[PDB]
Write a protein that binds this DNA or RNA. Sequence first.
DNA 1: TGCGAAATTCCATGACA
DNA 2: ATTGTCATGGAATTTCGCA
DNA 3: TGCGAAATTCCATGACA
DNA 4: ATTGTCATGGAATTTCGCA
Lengths: 182, 182, 367, 367
Amino acid sequence: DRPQKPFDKFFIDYIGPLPPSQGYLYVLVVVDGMTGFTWLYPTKAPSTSATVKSLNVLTSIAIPKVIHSDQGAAFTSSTFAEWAKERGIHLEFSTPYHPQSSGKVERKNSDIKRLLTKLLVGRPTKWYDLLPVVQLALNNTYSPVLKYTPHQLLFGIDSNTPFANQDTLDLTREEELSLLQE
Amino acid sequence: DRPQKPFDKFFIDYIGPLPPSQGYLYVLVVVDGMTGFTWLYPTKAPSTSATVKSLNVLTSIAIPKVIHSDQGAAFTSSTFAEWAKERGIHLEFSTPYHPQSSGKVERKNSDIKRLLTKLLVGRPTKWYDLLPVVQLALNNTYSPVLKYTPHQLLFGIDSNTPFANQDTLDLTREEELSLLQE
Amino acid sequence: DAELDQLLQGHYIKGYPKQYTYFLEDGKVKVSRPEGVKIIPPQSDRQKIVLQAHNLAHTGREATLLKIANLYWWPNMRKDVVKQLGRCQQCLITNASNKASGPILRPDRPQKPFDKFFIDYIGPLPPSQGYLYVLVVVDGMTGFTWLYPTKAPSTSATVKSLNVLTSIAIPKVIHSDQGAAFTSSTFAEWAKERGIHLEFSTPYHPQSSGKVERKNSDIKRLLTKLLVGRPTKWYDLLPVVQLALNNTYSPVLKYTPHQLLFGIDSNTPFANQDTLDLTREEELSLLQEIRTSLYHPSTPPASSRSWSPVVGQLVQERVARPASLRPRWHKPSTVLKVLNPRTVVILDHLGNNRTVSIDNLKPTSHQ
Amino acid sequence: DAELDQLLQGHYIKGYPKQYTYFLEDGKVKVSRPEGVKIIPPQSDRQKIVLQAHNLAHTGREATLLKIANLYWWPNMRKDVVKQLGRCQQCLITNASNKASGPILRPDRPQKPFDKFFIDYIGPLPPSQGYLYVLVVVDGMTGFTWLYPTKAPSTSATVKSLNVLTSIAIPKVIHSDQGAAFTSSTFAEWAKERGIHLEFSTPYHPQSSGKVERKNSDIKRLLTKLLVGRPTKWYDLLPVVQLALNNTYSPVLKYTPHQLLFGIDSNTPFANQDTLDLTREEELSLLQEIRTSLYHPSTPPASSRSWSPVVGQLVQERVARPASLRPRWHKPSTVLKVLNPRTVVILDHLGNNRTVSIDNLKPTSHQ
DNA sequence: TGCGAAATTCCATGACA
DNA sequence: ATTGTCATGGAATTTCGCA
DNA sequence: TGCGAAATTCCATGACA
DNA sequence: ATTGTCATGGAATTTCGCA
Ligand SMILES: COC(=O)CNc1c(C(=O)NCc2ccc(F)cc2F)c(=O)n(O)c2nc(OC)ccc12
Ligand SMILES: COC(=O)CNc1c(C(=O)NCc2ccc(F)cc2F)c(=O)n(O)c2nc(OC)ccc12
Ligand SMILES: [Mg+2]
Ligand SMILES: [Mg+2]
Ligand SMILES: [Mg+2]
Ligand SMILES: [Mg+2]
Ligand SMILES: [Mg+2]
Ligand SMILES: [Mg+2]
Ligand SMILES: [Zn+2]
Ligand SMILES: [Zn+2]
């Protein structure tokens, strides 16, 4: 069997609704299955229109062979199907109510939800500006299994922004109190 | 003694006043003494100002060593003297009431006055447009003494407008009658 | 399909080397080549493949082949690639040329003064006394130049200026570019009335007026020097500059334009006095021999990859004022006649006859 | 005057050849030379003579000498002529150079992706969806290019576009020309906040941004081809063109920019599949060796009359936007440091330090 | 071991306000 | 304190297929 | 009959929207 | 149906002044 490679499979899913930040409410999460590389796109709705608009940006850089997602309405629409067929992207869906992806991808999506929470508190409406630095942190997080960050696996080089200072990724006692109030 | 050459001496004099043609009343006549080459400049007055204005055109093509003229007021002024001194042109005047120049120049000025008269009749106010073709005719008139036209002596070449059909230069019986009426 | 069927059973087909194993896998004929396993598509599908590969980024020969070679192999792939490049209209009219024009001609200097005038306008310039342009008239033989300030590069200002100039002499031929002032019917009638032949440059080729253009350089250069640290009041300087340049030595000729025109300096500063003891007739004799012995440059060596026009060749004219994001070249046209190695008549994109300089032509690639 | 007095009586003075008869006529010392009789002016008058001859038409060495030689002779005339040419401020700042710049450098390709971005704006273009400009960001190592439509070449549109780009990776160095969008303090703070070093081209030298400028050519060329016979709606094509060029082979490299960046093609048409059996770690190993073995051009041969800058040399900077009838060159300035054979620091005409390309310099003539 | 032809490389040319 | 670049298609050169 | 230096010629370079 | 040109100043070459 052929070894796994970047662009073999993109895992997409929506995070939200979030507090409004510069008019955006959702984040389309795209994770490459082999490298763990993450792209974050802010959308205004979990719609096919918003998904196509954001994936058109990504697919102007690299086109995946397969897009995996759950049976979410935006991804199971006939419009999104025609969109994928036009780019030669095979759509692969997880069973309804049985969301499965990959250990590496499952853990990556955990990190994204926890990292977003950690920086949502104290400024829940300023996350649109923070999406760049979140993707950098996610993509320069050391992978205990592969012993390479997503950046290193995607580009074959070290990064100019290594993240050796890992956040606690857990909410400090003061961030738990300021979150139970929101 | 050094042979005579073009630009050694320019003979200048005013012809006029003439009938008004496009606002001009006089013709400043400039004849090179060696070649007989003629330049005609229409002026509005026989003034130093008009003379300087017209000779500035000519002296932007070729500067004579000597300008000869009669004791006409425009040529004996201190302004015209300063003008000639600035260009290194020596001014030479004929004796008052004793206008002398040169056989070739005397005859040339006769031709100019007679040629102007011949074409003044019938259209006395349209001579400004005719000055170009008058200079051409004058400068391509065969010289019986030198056996070369002024054009040939100035440029060392034949001309593209040879004037083999000489005007009568005399007034026909019908041009004498239409002139005695004006 | 039938051609490839005989290949699978091991029968030889010209173009397909025998030393390779041609097999079938996943309903596609494949070959095990050094670079890897490639798909051999049937003849009937290869044109569509070359087109799909070319149309990704409208790439040329090698960049298109490298795409196709990633998946496919067949005999003489580049032959099919080049065939598409010559049919792709967008590439033909958008791509640059990679072949230089043949070497320039150095037309013979006119034999006599007034044989040929070259004329052109300079401008617009900073307003001076209400004037914006300068009519520049250069005699071809002598370089002797007349300067006329005008308010527009118009026919009316050209005629008015040349009626004064032609007071001194009528030229055989006036050469100009195809500007509006010179191509109007009003200017043609003016020249026909005086027996002057109007000769025009090929369009959009100022080299053809190089005699005057080069003098424009000297005029602007002298004007600039005289105007340093002053407001640009150039109107009163035109007579000064005209006199100055007409009496300036050309180091290669060893003569000024005034001397080539008159054979003797006038009362200008540093007037040459060598012919002072000769008569005018002896002076003109020496002048006639000087005019014939003047240095004349020769055609330079052709650059290593130059092209020369051939009757019947497909060539393309450069678009004059190409809009933004629009092609720089017209659709291909045919060379009708070769007037000289640098000038041709073509069957225009509108269907007309057009005389163009090869500097505004490229040969159509891929024949 | 005393020098010439001893010459008339027949005494020898160095510089004046003895074999000529130096006589007096009309109060002027004269010599009977082959070309004729010339006036030998006293030393104290020769500077004024050279100046009067030069100032007729501000002529160079030979055209000025030929004027003086018409009347005068003295020892080493050209030496006095050249001395004036080097003191004539108008000639120094108006005349063209006749010495070409030294041969171009071919700076080493960046070792890694994201080591150096080159950025620049294209535009203005025909309005498309309200947009007029395109921010072009080219990775130096790979050629991989990002395209962003903007309404102005502004800092705010640059920052907004690069904040999206730097989501993927932060570069070590961003290189740009000295346009307003990139030189503003707002852009500097943006780059300092992210640890990016801003590197600027020398002024008025687009060759220095040649990496992006060359990619601008490909972008406009592809846009033009896709827009043939259509209204120029280029906004929706930027993603298409970006993908197309990033996946286009460079015939000399044998790789696409996508491949140099990722080491494997994505799901684009004609995706190369050579590394399909290698693991990702083996693939990246092959990628690291490919990035190091890429073709690198060398400095071309210097042209036969090129100049190279020397510390202390008098040089002149080209005027950026020279007005009509105004000099093309600034007053002479001194080379302070030679950063490389094509880049220097000069003591500016305003007194400042300025880093300029020698393509915008000429060496001051006559030392 | 060498031929004709195909394939690859070479590289001048030109354009990126 | 900074620096030209590279797609292009004929031509030159090398390699291939066969013997 | 030849040397050093001055003088002349050569000519690449660049600009004429 | 038309076509590059030529001032410039270092460098290359030739000529001069003297012996
Ligand atoms: C290809 O260049 C052009 O587009 C033509 N530009 C002109 C030019 C022009 O491009 N001049 C610059 C130039 C470039 C190269 C050259 F060898 C000489 C030259 F003058 C011009 O000089 N004149 O006089 C024009 N006169 C016109 O009359 C209306 C129209 C255009 C020009
Ligand atoms: C000397 O050329 C100029 O005057 C500079 N022109 C520009 C140019 C320019 O002249 N481009 C043409 C060009 C010419 C030669 C070259 F090697 C590359 C190139 F792009 C440019 O490309 N960009 O991007 C500019 N950006 C600016 O930012 C405000 C300002 C000017 C330019
Ligand atoms: Mg979901
Ligand atoms: Mg009188
Ligand atoms: Mg013109
Ligand atoms: Mg012109
Ligand atoms: Mg720019
Ligand atoms: Mg640019
Ligand atoms: Zn095409
Ligand atoms: Zn000067």
